[PDB]
Amino acid sequence: EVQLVQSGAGVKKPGSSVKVSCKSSGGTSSAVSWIRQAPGQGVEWMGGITSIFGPANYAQKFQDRLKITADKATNTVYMELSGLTFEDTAVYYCARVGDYNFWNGHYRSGYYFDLWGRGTLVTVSSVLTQPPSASGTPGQRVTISCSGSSSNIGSNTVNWYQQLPGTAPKLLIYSNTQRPSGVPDRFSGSKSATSASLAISGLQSEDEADYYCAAWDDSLNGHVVFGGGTKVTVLGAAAENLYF
Amino acid sequence: RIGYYEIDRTIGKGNFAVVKRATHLVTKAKVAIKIIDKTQLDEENLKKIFREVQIMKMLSHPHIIRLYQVMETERMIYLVTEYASGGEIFDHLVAHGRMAEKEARRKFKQIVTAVYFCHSRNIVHRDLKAENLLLDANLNIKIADFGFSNLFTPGQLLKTWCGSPPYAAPELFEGKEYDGPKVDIWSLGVVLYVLVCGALPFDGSTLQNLRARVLSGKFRIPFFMSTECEHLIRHMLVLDPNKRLSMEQICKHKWMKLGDADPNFDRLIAESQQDPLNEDVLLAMEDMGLDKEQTLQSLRSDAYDHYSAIYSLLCD
Ligand SMILES: COc1cc(-c2cnn3cc(C(C)(C)C#N)ccc23)cc(OC(F)F)c1C(=O)N[C@@H]1C[C@@H]1F
Numbered sequence A: 001e002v003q004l005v006q007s008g009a010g011v012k013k014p015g016s017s018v019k020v021s022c023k024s025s026g027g028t029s030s031a032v033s034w035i036r037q038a039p040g041q042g043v044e045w046m047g048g049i050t051s052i053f054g055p056a057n058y059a060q061k062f063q064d065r066l067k068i069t070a071d072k073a074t075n076t077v078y079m080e081l082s083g084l085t086f087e088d089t090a091v092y093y094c095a096r097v098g099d100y101n102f103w104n105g106h107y108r109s110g111y112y113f114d115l116w117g118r119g120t121l122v123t124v125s126s127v128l129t130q131p132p133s134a135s136g137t138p139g140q141r142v143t144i145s146c147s148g149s150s151s152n153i154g155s156n157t158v159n160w161y162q163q164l165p166g167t168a169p170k171l172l173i174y175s176n177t178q179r180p181s182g183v184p185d186r187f188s189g190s191k192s193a194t195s196a197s198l199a200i201s202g203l204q205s206e207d208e209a210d211y212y213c214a215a216w217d218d219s220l221n222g223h224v225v226f227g228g229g230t231k232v233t234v235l236g237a238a239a240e241n242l243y244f
Numbered sequence B: 001r002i003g004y005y006e007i008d009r010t011i012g013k014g015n016f017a018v019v020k021r022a023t024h025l026v027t028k029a030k031v032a033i034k035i036i037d038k039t040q041l042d043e044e045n046l047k048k049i050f051r052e053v054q055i056m057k058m059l060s061h062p063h064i065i066r067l068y069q070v071m072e073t074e075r076m077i078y079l080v081t082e083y084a085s086g087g088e089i090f091d092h093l094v095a096h097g098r099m100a101e102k103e104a105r106r107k108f109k110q111i112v113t114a115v116y117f118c119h120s121r122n123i124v125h126r127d128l129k130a131e132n133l134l135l136d137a138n139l140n141i142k143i144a145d146f147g148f149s150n151l152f153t154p155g156q157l158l159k160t161w162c163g164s165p166p167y168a169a170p171e172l173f174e175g176k177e178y179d180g181p182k183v184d185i186w187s188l189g190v191v192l193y194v195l196v197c198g199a200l201p202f203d204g205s206t207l208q209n210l211r212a213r214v215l216s217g218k219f220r221i222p223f224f225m226s227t228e229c230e231h232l233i234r235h236m237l238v239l240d241p242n243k244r245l246s247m248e249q250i251c252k253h254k255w256m257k258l259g260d261a262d263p264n265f266d267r268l269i270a271e272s273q274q275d276p277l278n279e280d281v282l283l284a285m286e287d288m289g290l291d292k293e294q295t296l297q298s299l300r301s302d303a304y305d306h307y308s309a310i311y312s313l314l315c316d
Helices: A098-102 B043-058 B089-096 B100-121 B181-197 B209-214 B227-234 B247-251 B265-272 B279-285 B292-300 B306-314
Strands: A002-008 A011-014 A018-023 A032-037 A045-050 A066-071 A076-081 A090-097 A111-116 A120-124 A133-136 A142-147 A158-163 A172-173 A187-192 A195-200 A211-219 A223-226 A230-234 B005-013 B017-024 B029-038 B067-072 B076-082 B133-135 B141-143
Touching: A002 A090, A018 A090, A018 A120, A032 A066, A045 A066, A045 A090, A045 A223, A066 A133, A066 B089, A066 B181, A076 A090, A090 A098, A111 A172, A133 A142, A133 B017, A133 B043, A158 A187, A158 A195, A195 A211, B005 B029, B005 B265, B017 B306, B043 B067, B043 B076, B089 B133, B089 B181, B100 B141, B100 B181, B100 B265, B181 B227, B181 B247, B279 B292, B279 B306, B292 B306
Parallel strands: A011 A120, A133 A230
Antiparallel strands: A002 A018, A018 A076, A032 A045, A032 A090, A066 A076, A090 A111, A090 A120, A142 A195, A158 A172, A158 A211, A187 A195, A211 A223, A211 A230, B005 B017, B017 B029, B029 B076, B067 B076, B133 B141
């Protein structure tokens, strides 16, 4: 129904700047953030609208080279990254913050990404601790840990994302334990003091994907932090052998 | 719709007011109308509206929103002011991002010109924010919303804890008695920062987080910002109000004197350190049926009535 349509892929020479668009094509005011993912790497928050107070909020790493703008008239959000280096080759996604309609200055947002764009591959040519991998046999339960600090998990809700190959991450768990529509009761979340956990009960082959935990970090002017990503691997079923 | 005005699109919202766009039916001029329902107002808030009206009557400046007419019914109070058809600084930053120091310098000069003028007439704004710095058709600043403004005596301590949280000085969060102009100078530092950065120096998820940031006094200074600009901001955003730059020191800062020589800025700041009747307009008003001596009495008595508004609007 509502979808985020991004601009096409591109090649930039080092030193130049790139402008990526993200147009909302559905039943419309939003809080779009920009997240990038380098080839074979984890997801990283660059900036976007995160408070009722300012026009935009940028991650420290990107403050100097990122410009985030919006055209309210056409429902289009832009991102401009300047002084490109070979390290800026990545897929850039725009994502909408779910609880934007609830923002009051007193309401603390969960910063969960409701809708994601399909991604834009830009190529340059001339904090949260998660285990790198998890595994289990079908039918079994696999648990992914996610430890952090008191500034992020200790003070905010944790959200989990599932990323299938060649697709944008998808919201799996929001506000610590909640599941969006479509997510089965097999997936469950939990949070205690500075750590969060995701349990995948009754493991299926279809669950083989990368899993990311995320939470709002109150350090500096605030920013969303992500885990490194856990590559869950589903092994062969126990019924494949009389011994197993 | 309302007296001699044709009301339409809502262009603003306050705690107890709704600013709608309107057209003068006799002059065809485009105006803004602040609409306030007196039924939902306590006697402390009713006094703050009447204070705002009196403060606006004292401020006639090219970079301040001009009050044209004040209408009051048994349950309503309307403030008809000039309309800024260009937008506002907050929307401009959302649409185009940070301003170049050259573009930022021009708008900042216009803001300090209007804030200096206020301090000359012994008035402090106490609510300077990006969303309250409008832009006319030529993209020139017009400061709006004097609801939290107050009269001050140079050397007095004020006791009203108000302001936009991201622009509010630390003393306001701490509930300390403060010097008026020193509180506006802190807001100006945040305004200058957000103009050249397209983001706030102190920000957070909630008001509690924002407060902790403002009281720390620490803020990141981006790579693209000049050494001259960094010096000015670092000397305005000072936790001790006594160690902050004065309005005169801001106007004579090295970053301010940068670029081309601006004698028009010097003429406006010199005017703050200190007119006739348009006979053609008076003749046109006499043709509409409006009395010549009654128009003059309304003008000299600061009535801000039907005769004042028609004269002021016709002089454009
Ligand atoms: C910024 O606060 C005001 C702005 C304006 C105003 C003038 N031109 N204009 C243009 C636009 C655009 C074109 C950007 C749009 N849309 C927006 C606002 C205005 C008028 C105002 O009051 C006037 F009616 F007395 C106020 C005001 O004091 N508001 C206080 C909060 C309580 F309501």
